[PDB]
A paper describes a structure:
The [name] Pentamer, composed of gH, gL, [name], [name], and [name], enhances entry into epithelial, endothelial, and myeloid cells by interacting with the cell surface receptor neuropilin 2 ([name]). The other critical tropism-determining complex is the [name] Pentamer, which is composed of glycoproteins [name], [name], and [name] and the same gH and gL proteins that comprise the bulk of the [name] Trimer. This elongated heteropentamer mediates tropism for endothelial and epithelial cells by binding to neuropilin 2 ([name]) and triggering the viral fusion protein, gB, to facilitate entry into host cells.
The addition of 2 mM CaCl2 enabled us to form a stable ~230-kDa complex that was suitable for cryo-EM screening. Additional contacts are formed between the C-terminal β strands of ULs 130/131A and a loop formed by residues 453 to 461 of the b2 domain of [name]. The CendR-binding mechanism involves the engagement of a C-terminal arginine residue by the b1 domain, whereas Pentamer is exclusively bound by the a1, a2, and b2 domains. Whereas the [name] a2, b1, and b2 domains are clustered tightly together at the apex of the Pentamer, the N-terminal a1 domain is tethered via a flexible linker that allows it to bind near the middle of the Pentamer, where the C terminus of [name] associates with gL. Ion coordination by the [name] a2 domain, in particular, plays a crucial role in rigidifying the loop such that it is positioned to interact with the UL proteins.
Author numbering:
A (entry chain D): 104 to 214
B (entry chain E): 19 to 100, 104 to 129
C (entry chain N): 148 to 198, 207 to 268, 276 to 507, 517 to 593
D (entry chain C): 29 to 135
């Protein structure tokens, strides 16, 4: 079966060591001299499309009123010729039709 | 720190973005604990999209509160890791606010 | 709803229900939109709103509301003085609270239609609401409102003769000044008196920040009346563009006395230049674009000349000379005649720049100077607030870009408006 | 005038706007229409309005003291609003939030 083989392909990369190590090294205070092995970088290069973008909507209730807002997620991956890997994200919030100041753009959170 | 006694001067005037400009910075452990969740979930979503999954169960779980707090914190001071491993920057504007960050891992 | 739109040669306006009390929780807005080259004159005839006010108010905008400059917020029982505009759009906004109302307002609107015509200090064209000062003396016999040049009455004096005390007048619309005329004042009741010997001019577009007139590197001190008997007038070597004007004395022979006159012009009274609407808001927010921005979340409203709190900056303040540009699409083919350029508030300004245009996309013509040697370069501002106007041969276009080439060491930063015609 | 009457014996439920008119009196937009109210305990206006503060949409709070550019605002016990400061006790603020209540919706 072709689709079976495509599922096998998809699940083969899932558990990759980079996809575990990244969120740790993104959270530690320093940990800059992280080593990653060349073969792991190679198999990372095999699995990521250089672009993705998504919109998702959500609703917030300000007491009696309701307000609808669009989150945009856009993300990129790359592999340098020196086998370095790079991943980046940009995440934005906006009113579902543009507005000057709204609960989604300015929650004024108490902290 | 904020220019507190220049912004706070009067009861009946505040420069816009005042509250987000001088609300207190997050405890640093909390900051890392939120960043770890966000990097994890967005990397999962990217791999799954790279293979054409819809992946809605993952996208459901990004907490808008926590990202908004990080946007504020990286606006007060955009932060950088330990050839520097990491970068994060906030941005804030009337119609929108945003977060941008990157993680890099090195062959050497 | 109540948000009636008007364009007709003569008419009337009022809050819903007149002379009856206006409803609660209104948020009405009204627009007067003039034909080209036609003045708007607006005169109020009743004003009584219950109360800088906090509950109910009338705003007036020199443009679309929340886009054009605010003319004023008006409230209580002082009838807003008659106002005249050439910018072509004048909008009113009426806010009411949930709970209290009074007789409201009614007004009437009309239309009609060198550079040394008096603005109208003597002729009441500056109403008593437009004049103010730092303080009065205790006696109330030298108040600001009497500063009419040929008023056979005492001049102004503040509580102390000193160099910080000031007189201020608000010319509600952008207006161009050519000369300042002065008289001293003997007291009519007691034949001793006061007169100014020298004084300084402070000018602003916005009133929150200022520029003090200079001629050469030194600040100017003007020379003034020898005694209170006769008029003196002093003429500016090139016209200033201003909204607020403030006179500060510097040396008084025996007390401070000011009677004053303001000579000038409208910018609309060059041959055919009208502002196409960066200031008034008629260039919508989608029509302004730039090569780069100081952050990803740019807001194009920063470009406007007097309605923007802070100006544009490129992504890097020290960009490559002539690499960055700012563009407007005028939305229709138009004659362009000139532009007005201003600094941005870092506090920085553009010093030399060039202009380029096309009737269509993917094309760029250069507005070369008449001589064959090189493309025309225009001298810009010398200060972050005071605008400067530059004029060139008739150029039909629809896309216009401005390219900086020299800037204040704090980087490129700018605000802009374009003078067009048909 | 803002009141000539009192229309109430206890604070009406689920109301949605307020304005104080005398110093001694406060009146409310409520589902049934407006009510004018007074507590004899002259401090209680603050408690009453605080107990109603959940309803007030961000624009209604911005119409008051509107120079405060949508930033949170505070109640003195005598009823006058001022701009709140970032240090102020979180109870006595309107327009602040403890969290953004949110629900993803499918596309
Ligand atoms: C979002 O985060 C806040 C604090 O960070 C927490 O109290 C809340 O339960 C979280 N909600 C979700 C859905 O994760
Ligand atoms: C409009 O009003 C002006 C006011 O001076 C008057 O001169 C003019 O005749 C009026 N025109 C009409 C058509 O009423
Ligand atoms: Ca009212």
């Amino acid at each position: 079966s072709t689709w079976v083989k495509k599922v096998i392909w998809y699940l083969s990369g899932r558990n990759q060591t980079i996809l575990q190590r990244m969120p740790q090294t993104a959270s530690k205070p320093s940990d800059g001299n992280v080593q990653i092995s060349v073969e792991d970088a190679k198999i990372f290069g095999a699995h990521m499309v250089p672009k993705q973008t998504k919109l998702l909507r959500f609703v917030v209730n300000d007491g009696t009123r309701y307000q609808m807002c669009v989150m945009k997620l856009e993300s990129w991956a790359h592999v340098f010729r020196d086998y370095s890997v790079s991943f980046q994200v940009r995440l934005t919030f906006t009113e579902a039709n543009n507005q000057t100041y709204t609960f989604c753009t300015h929650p004024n959170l108490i902290v | 720190q904020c220019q507190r006694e220049t912004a706070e001067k009067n009861d009946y005037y505040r420069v816009p973005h005042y509250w987000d400009a001088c609300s207190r910075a997050l405890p640093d452990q909390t900051r890392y604990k939120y960043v770890e969740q966000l990097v994890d979930l967005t990397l999962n979503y990217h791999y799954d999209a790279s293979h054409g999954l819809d992946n809605f169960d993952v996208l459901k779980r990004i907490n808008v509160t926590e990202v908004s707090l990080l946007i504020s914190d990286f606006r007060r001071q955009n932060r950088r890791g330990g050839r520097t491993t990491f970068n994060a920057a906030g941005s804030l504007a009337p119609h929108a606010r945003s977060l941008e960050f990157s993680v890099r891992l090195f062959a050497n | 709803d109540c948000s009636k739109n008007f364009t007709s040669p003569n008419g009337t306006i009022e809050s819903p229900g007149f002379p009856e009390k206006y409803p609660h929780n209104l948020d009405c807005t009204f627009t007067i939109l003039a034909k080209p080259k036609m003045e708007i004159i607006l005169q109020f005839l009743i004003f009584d709103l219950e109360h800088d006010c906090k509950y109910d108010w009338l705003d007036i905008w020199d443009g679309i509301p929340h886009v054009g400059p605010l003319i004023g917020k008006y409230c209580g029982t002082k009838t807003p003085s008659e106002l005249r505009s050439s910018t072509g759009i004048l909008s009113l906004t009426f806010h009411t609270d949930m709970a209290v109302a009074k007789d409201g307002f009614s007004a009437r609107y009309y239309l009609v239609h060198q550079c040394n015509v008096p603005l109208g200090m003597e002729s009441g064209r500056i109403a008593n609401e437009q004049i103010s000062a730092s303080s009065t003396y205790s006696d109330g016999r030298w108040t600001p409102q009497q500063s009419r040049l040929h008023g056979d009455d005492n001049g102004w004096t503040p509580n102390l003769d000193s160099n910080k005390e000031y007189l201020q007048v608000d010319l509600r619309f952008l207006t161009m000044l050519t000369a300042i005329a002065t008289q001293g004042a003997i007291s009519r009741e007691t034949q001793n008196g006061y007169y100014v010997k020298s004084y300084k001019l402070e000018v602003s577009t916005n009133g929150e920040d200022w520029m003090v007139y200079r001629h050469g590197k030194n600040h100017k001190v003007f020379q003034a009346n020898n005694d209170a008997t006769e008029v003196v007038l002093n003429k500016l070597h090139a016209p200033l563009l201003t909204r607020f004007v403030r006179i500060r004395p510097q040396t008084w022979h025996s007390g401070i006395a000011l009677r004053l006159e303001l000579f000038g012009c409208r910018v609309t009274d060059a041959p055919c230049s009208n502002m196409l609407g960066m200031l008034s808001g008629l260039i919508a927010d989608s029509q302004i674009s730039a090569s780069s921005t100081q952050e990803y979340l740019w807001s194009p409203s920063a470009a406007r000349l007097v309605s923007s709190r802070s100006g544009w900056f490129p992504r890097i303040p020290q960009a490559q000379p002539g690499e960055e540009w700012l563009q407007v699409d005028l939305g229709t083919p138009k004659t362009v005649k000139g532009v007005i350029i201003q600094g941005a508030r870092a506090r920085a300004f553009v010093r030399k720049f060039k202009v380029s245009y096309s009737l269509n996309g993917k094309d760029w013509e250069y507005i070369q100077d008449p001589r064959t040697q090189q493309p025309k370069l225009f001298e810009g501002n010398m200060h972050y607030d005071t605008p400067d106007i530059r004029r060139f041969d008739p150029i039909p276009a629809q896309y216009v870009r401005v390219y900086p080439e020299r800037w204040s060491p704090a980087g490129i930063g700018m605000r802009l408006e374009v003078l067009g015609c048909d | 005038e803002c009141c000539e009457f009192i229309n109430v014996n206890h604070p009406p439920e689920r109301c949605y706007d307020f304005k104080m008119c005398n110093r001694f009196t406060v009146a409310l937009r409520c589902p049934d229409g407006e009510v004018c109210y007074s507590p004899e305990k002259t401090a209680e206006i603050r408690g009453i309005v605080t107990t109603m503060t959940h309803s007030l949409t961000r624009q209604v709070v911005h119409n008051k003291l509107t120079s405060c550019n949508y930033n949170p605002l505070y109640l003195e016990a005598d009823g006058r609003i001022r701009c709140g400061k970032v240090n102020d006790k979180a109870q006595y603020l309107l327009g602040a939030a403890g969290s953004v209540p949110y629900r993803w919706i499918n596309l």
